[PDB]
Amino acid sequence: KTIGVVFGKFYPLHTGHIYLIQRACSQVDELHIIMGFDDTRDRALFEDSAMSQQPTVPDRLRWLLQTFKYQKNIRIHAFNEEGMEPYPHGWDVWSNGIKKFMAEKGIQPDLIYTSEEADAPQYMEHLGIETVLVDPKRTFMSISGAQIRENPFRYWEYIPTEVKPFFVRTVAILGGESSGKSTLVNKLANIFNTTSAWEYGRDYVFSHLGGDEIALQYSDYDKIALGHAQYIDFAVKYANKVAFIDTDFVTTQAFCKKYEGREHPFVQALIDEYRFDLVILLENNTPWVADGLRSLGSSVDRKEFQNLLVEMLEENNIEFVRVEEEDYDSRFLRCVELVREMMGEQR
Amino acid sequence: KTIGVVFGKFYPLHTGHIYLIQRACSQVDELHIIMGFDDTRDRALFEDSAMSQQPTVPDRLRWLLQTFKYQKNIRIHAFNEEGMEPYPHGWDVWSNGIKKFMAEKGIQPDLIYTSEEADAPQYMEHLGIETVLVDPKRTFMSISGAQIRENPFRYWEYIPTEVKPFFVRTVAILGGESSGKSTLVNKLANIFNTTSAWEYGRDYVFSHLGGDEIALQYSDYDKIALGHAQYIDFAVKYANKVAFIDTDFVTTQAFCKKYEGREHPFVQALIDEYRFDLVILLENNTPWVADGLRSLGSSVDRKEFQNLLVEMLEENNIEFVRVEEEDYDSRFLRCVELVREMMGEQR
Amino acid sequence: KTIGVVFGKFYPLHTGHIYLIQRACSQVDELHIIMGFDDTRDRALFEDSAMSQQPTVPDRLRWLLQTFKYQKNIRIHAFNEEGMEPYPHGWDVWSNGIKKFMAEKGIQPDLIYTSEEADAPQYMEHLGIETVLVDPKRTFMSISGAQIRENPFRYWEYIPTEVKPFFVRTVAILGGESSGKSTLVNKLANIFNTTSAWEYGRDYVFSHLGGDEIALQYSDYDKIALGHAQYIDFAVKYANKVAFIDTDFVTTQAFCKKYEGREHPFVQALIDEYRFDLVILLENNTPWVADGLRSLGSSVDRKEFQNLLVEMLEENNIEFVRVEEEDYDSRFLRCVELVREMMGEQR
Amino acid sequence: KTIGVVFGKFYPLHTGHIYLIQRACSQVDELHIIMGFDDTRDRALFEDSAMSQQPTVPDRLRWLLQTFKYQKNIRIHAFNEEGMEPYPHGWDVWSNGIKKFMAEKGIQPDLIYTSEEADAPQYMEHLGIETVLVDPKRTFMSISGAQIRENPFRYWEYIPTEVKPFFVRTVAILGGESSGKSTLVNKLANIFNTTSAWEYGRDYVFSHLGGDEIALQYSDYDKIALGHAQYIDFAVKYANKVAFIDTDFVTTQAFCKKYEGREHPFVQALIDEYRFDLVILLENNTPWVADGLRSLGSSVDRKEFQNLLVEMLEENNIEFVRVEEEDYDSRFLRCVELVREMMGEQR
Numbered sequence A, B, C, D: 001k002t003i004g005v006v007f008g009k010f011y012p013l014h015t016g017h018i019y020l021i022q023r024a025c026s027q028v029d030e031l032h033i034i035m036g037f038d039d040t041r042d043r044a045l046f047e048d049s050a051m052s053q054q055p056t057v058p059d060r061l062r063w064l065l066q067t068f069k070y071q072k073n074i075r076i077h078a079f080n081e082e083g084m085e086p087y088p089h090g091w092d093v094w095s096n097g098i099k100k101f102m103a104e105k106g107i108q109p110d111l112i113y114t115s116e117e118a119d120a121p122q123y124m125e126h127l128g129i130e131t132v133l134v135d136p137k138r139t140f141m142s143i144s145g146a147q148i149r150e151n152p153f154r155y156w157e158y159i160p161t162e163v164k165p166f167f168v169r170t171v172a173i174l175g176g177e178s179s180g181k182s183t184l185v186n187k188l189a190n191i192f193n194t195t196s197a198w199e200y201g202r203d204y205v206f207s208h209l210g211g212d213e214i215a216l217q218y219s220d221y222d223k224i225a226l227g228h229a230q231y232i233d234f235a236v237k238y239a240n241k242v243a244f245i246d247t248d249f250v251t252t253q254a255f256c257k258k259y260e261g262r263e264h265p266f267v268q269a270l271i272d273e274y275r276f277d278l279v280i281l282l283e284n285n286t287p288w289v290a291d292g293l294r295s296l297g298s299s300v301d302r303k304e305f306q307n308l309l310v311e312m313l314e315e316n317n318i319e320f321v322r323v324e325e326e327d328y329d330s331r332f333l334r335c336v337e338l339v340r341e342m343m344g345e346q347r
């Protein structure tokens, strides 16, 4: 009893929608969310926006599902509105489609919750369900979805953590052994006040092979890669407008192919799935420093792995940048301007 | 061996200082930070600022130590400058004191890193050490420490996560069991796009006593409270200008004293140590619903625990607010407006 | 609704009781366990047994509660039989007492589950409740509780992990800084194929103070102590008849008193609560090892801390042993010899 | 310098070898272990033994690497002795092969550590390196490797946690939706005093999709499987002679093929890699009980999934057992006799 229904494109979902839904859910015993999609309209919206990746219907479903995880009276549905006139001219076919969708899903709504004053009479006259206006003057939040899509980094405090991955500009740094990748990633995450992701390969090697790579085999090489992804998902979930990644899947695929002689289908699937906004490739220019934790001191093998990284980066058609400064300070500076140019703010 | 020294009040530490220190540390083999303090001056600065809690010398040492955890060439020292003329009249006694401080600490600095163009000649002529200017035009960051102290919620992206606990306005919600504390805390953390801390008591009970409180004893009551603190430290470390706390130490003292007959010194020390900016107290207005897990379903026991909570809140002289609305939506609105008044954002 | 009741002192609980309870609970909607205790009888049983620590009524309640944590239809109660007639007269007063106890606890049992052939007719005669015999020939398990109490290390596979802490012979190793405690504890845990507990203080310092001890304060010194306990609870929960502990609460109390001038009530409460079967004290025979973390390089301070450890060990009247061999191999041999003697079983 | 070398096939490694190696490592600055292998001899040894799975050279390397993880002065190598007459007549070419291996690996041994009285003069004559006898009377451990291979469950306390996975008899239980297999796995782990592994799919669904499977996609179906393996590795690492597994990879393959319409190469690779000693198939005897979390309440879908499970089990040539008894107590009993027959220890 007392069923509440919220309609919305939710593209993207922001804290105004959250405030609306959580003001509505405290007033009803069960709240149903129905989000409609159209492939061409959503594709155009993504094209004209500043999102890093294009969401799919399951991805936006995941947004809404992760937002209300600890609220047990909220259900989520996705609806298809192909072959319909756009708003506000397709007010007849859309209503019939939504009525059929509710009939299929068994929903018997009693109240419709909305924050548009002109849309309420239209809802009442078509869907025949009484509507309740929540925050009609937009006192809690005044920012609109278009302003968020155009400039997300100025309204960063209104974007939930589940919606953040499609707005975070992820930076992947690649480099040879003992090239200073980890310290550079840490410094970049520090000055930018954001998160970072470490190379899961070293963690896996120590926590499963006692710290030696002699016992590494083909079947292991697909855990590492997948484990690496579990770090990336973390760094992008809590980033401050930018996240930094210590190593790509190109490097793990390269290690797998060079040691075991054959590729791995799931690492290639991850390569295809995971696309990075900016990729930075360091060089082997820095002289070798003896440490004691790695006996692979030969620079010929380093150059061979670097060249194989270049060719495998070209194989998947992945764009990257090269930094050639021997000194660490200049390389840090150049990475700073690269990130700042990626941000899109000029001098 | 190419020693670099940075001087600073660092009160509070912000991303401009971080950028300075990490531009300096990549250029030297070892960077020493010397932080001078004066009790009365720092007390006045805290009084005139908007910080939630007053930092101590160990607390700011902890700031600087947690910032550069993964940078292994940075050392931190604290120095006392009592009985010295303020800047810039005290350019002679301070220099002698700081020189004696390096003498006692064994530092032999070679370079001093600073971002003040006017201060460089005094450094050169007093300490006899060449100075290096880093970002003299403040291109990377232009915000000053005073602007952060006066209005920290507008420059929130420049405050590190180690310095954040002394700026986050922590809200503690108190209420009886099965009164809706958890859902309210979750909703407040959702609409405000911030973190929250759950009641560690339930977690401890399930993970150590099989989910029943019959096996609870006096010596257990000091684990729970301390464990509760480990949640609070998390919520304030990642908050979006405000953190929400599900239960205070007053409640665990209440349970301990009512079930065991005696208090516990450590949880009282925690009460003294942990001070909250806003405390909200709910009522027993909501009717009891049979759950099969609590035998104290009578409203008499609930009222007794509520009155004991009130008297123990008065015993420690802790101010709080009372919300009496039976409906959930009105209570949520009252909590929202209380938090908004606490924010202080004027119109 | 189809209520089953199981009686027993469960002192200690073993896998025969577990098998009986699982077989009973697979056949009833809810199973109630009622365990009776008598102070003098239980004290005598503990005295004549080989348990390391004496359980209390809450401790045995915790055993039974942690055993059936994921079985949601099992309840647990404790009953008092003081002022009781001597055996075998204890079949009439005990029946009245249990009937009354079930009266205030509201239980209305329908079946009594037992594994005694002769006790069943007396149960039927006194309690008036039909009894069901489970495994009357003891096919699944034949070992009795007395054999477990006398020799627990020969029937180690029948003792649950919740009951194990009162049978594990915990060994605590104490020694000066950089004396080799960690490697010795690891070797002892390796050759004995068991668990160990690391010093939580180092972990806390690195994970909360950036790895330096300057930011350590009085209020911190309690967390460390409690954290240390959380390691001990782990090591004893999975030990192979013996668990090894890297540091006692005497050392953390010593550090707190030396660096603060006052003790801590909760560390003293932990000292009183936590009693170790064997305590081993090492010497300062090995030369100090430079690491870069300690400014107290003088051996005078090391000897002062060692003497303070001795005096604080004597203050609470805690017995210990001294190992004085300079070489590591002989010290390992002496530790093995001491542990083997403390086992008490020669072959 | 003081280099020490230990020889042995370590097939399997037991606590006598650990005691030898850790008595030798305290006496030398660096210890080297060299495992010689022969494919046919090792295959015959595995055939005549009672191991559940056949180790490979990397697997035994992993044993030795994980055992001495926290001992930093131990290195591990593998050596090939193809075309060698067995001991003790192949004492001539074997010495030359080991000398060449020393030359390749750069080892310059100073002492050889062994526990054989007759081999010491032979070692001195051939390898020309002084030998040290450790525990020649086998006082600490007297059990031999052959006794462990023939009967591992009577010397279970001598098998390290790294070697245990190749001796644990893993049991995998398969059942329909809401068939109660988790409680059965828990009961079996309880009465056998061992570990178990839960279905990682439910955990992944709640922790990544808000608790609903609507947002499940093809690329997700490969994390779940991998995550499931991470549970299995745990359960077998701490098992008491037997580990219980809640779900196989056949079920996740079934779900992936049924919903997404296509298989996944990595889950098939896991199927090939992970072979279980006993597989138990639970059918749909128990009637479906409505809960509100699954809308496929019809038994037709359950029957279809069971039939697809059967055909995919037959496709991979995996043997299994069907338990059709309705009673939960009877099914628990039947699983008990199945596990006991697998144990092979009769009356």
Ligand SMILES: NC(=O)c1ccc[n+]([C@@H]2O[C@H](COP(=O)([O-])OP(=O)(O)OC[C@H]3O[C@@H](n4cnc5c(N)ncnc54)[C@H](O)[C@@H]3O)[C@@H](O)[C@H]2O)c1
Binding pocket: A007, A008, A009, A010, A011, A015, A016, A017, A019, A020, A035, A036, A081, A084, A085, A086, A087, A088, A089, A090, A091, A094, A113, A114, A115, A116, A134, A135, A138, A141, A142, A143, A145
């Ligand atoms: N011709 C058509 O195709 C048909 C025509 C009639 C219906 N519309 C449908 O109506 C649906 C509604 O789309 P939408 O534009 O409203 O999506 P939306 O995400 O922009 O809005 C979702 C809801 O949240 C409310 N809201 C937004 N910001 C708020 C804030 N700051 N505070 C409080 N509330 C706020 C909105 O008033 C709205 O009710 C569309 O999916 C669309 O399919 C389309």
Ligand SMILES: NC(=O)c1ccc[n+]([C@@H]2O[C@H](COP(=O)([O-])OP(=O)(O)OC[C@H]3O[C@@H](n4cnc5c(N)ncnc54)[C@H](O)[C@@H]3O)[C@@H](O)[C@H]2O)c1
Binding pocket: B007, B008, B009, B010, B011, B015, B016, B017, B019, B020, B036, B037, B081, B084, B085, B086, B087, B088, B089, B090, B091, B094, B113, B114, B115, B116, B134, B135, B138, B141, B142, B143, B145
């Ligand atoms: N008491 C006296 O008379 C004596 C006189 C001479 C020395 N001073 C001492 O010198 C110390 C210096 O303190 P402070 O006032 O510089 O504290 P501060 O935190 O404001 O400065 C810290 C350092 O960081 C630099 N910095 C600040 N913002 C920056 C930004 N956005 N980008 C780059 N760099 C930035 C500053 O130039 C400064 O060098 C004082 O603590 C004080 O003890 C005092």
Ligand SMILES: NC(=O)c1ccc[n+]([C@@H]2O[C@H](COP(=O)([O-])OP(=O)(O)OC[C@H]3O[C@@H](n4cnc5c(N)ncnc54)[C@H](O)[C@@H]3O)[C@@H](O)[C@H]2O)c1
Binding pocket: C007, C008, C009, C010, C011, C015, C016, C017, C019, C020, C035, C036, C037, C086, C087, C088, C089, C090, C091, C094, C113, C114, C115, C116, C134, C135, C138, C141, C142, C143, C145
């Ligand atoms: N003076 C008297 O009249 C008499 C004296 C002895 C018993 N006590 C009463 O009896 C109670 C204690 O009962 P208890 O002695 O049976 O406790 P118990 O722990 O020895 O046994 C508990 C239950 O587990 C069963 N069991 C034990 N081992 C088993 C195995 N290997 N397999 C299957 N089942 C197994 C036992 O048959 C028993 O039913 C006391 O609380 C007290 O109330 C009174």
Ligand SMILES: NC(=O)c1ccc[n+]([C@@H]2O[C@H](COP(=O)([O-])OP(=O)(O)OC[C@H]3O[C@@H](n4cnc5c(N)ncnc54)[C@H](O)[C@@H]3O)[C@@H](O)[C@H]2O)c1
Binding pocket: D007, D008, D009, D010, D011, D016, D017, D019, D020, D034, D035, D036, D037, D038, D041, D081, D084, D085, D086, D087, D088, D090, D091, D094, D113, D114, D115, D116, D134, D135, D138, D141, D142, D143, D145
């Ligand atoms: N090709 C062949 O068949 C044959 C030919 C030459 C000799 N072996 C070679 O020599 C080595 C074989 O050594 P192994 O058979 O002794 O392997 P092993 O696993 O049986 O023992 C390895 C070492 O551990 C010692 N040890 C075993 N149990 C002990 C205990 N309880 N306490 C203390 N020490 C204990 C042994 O004395 C031995 O030194 C291999 O490298 C192998 O290649 C092979």
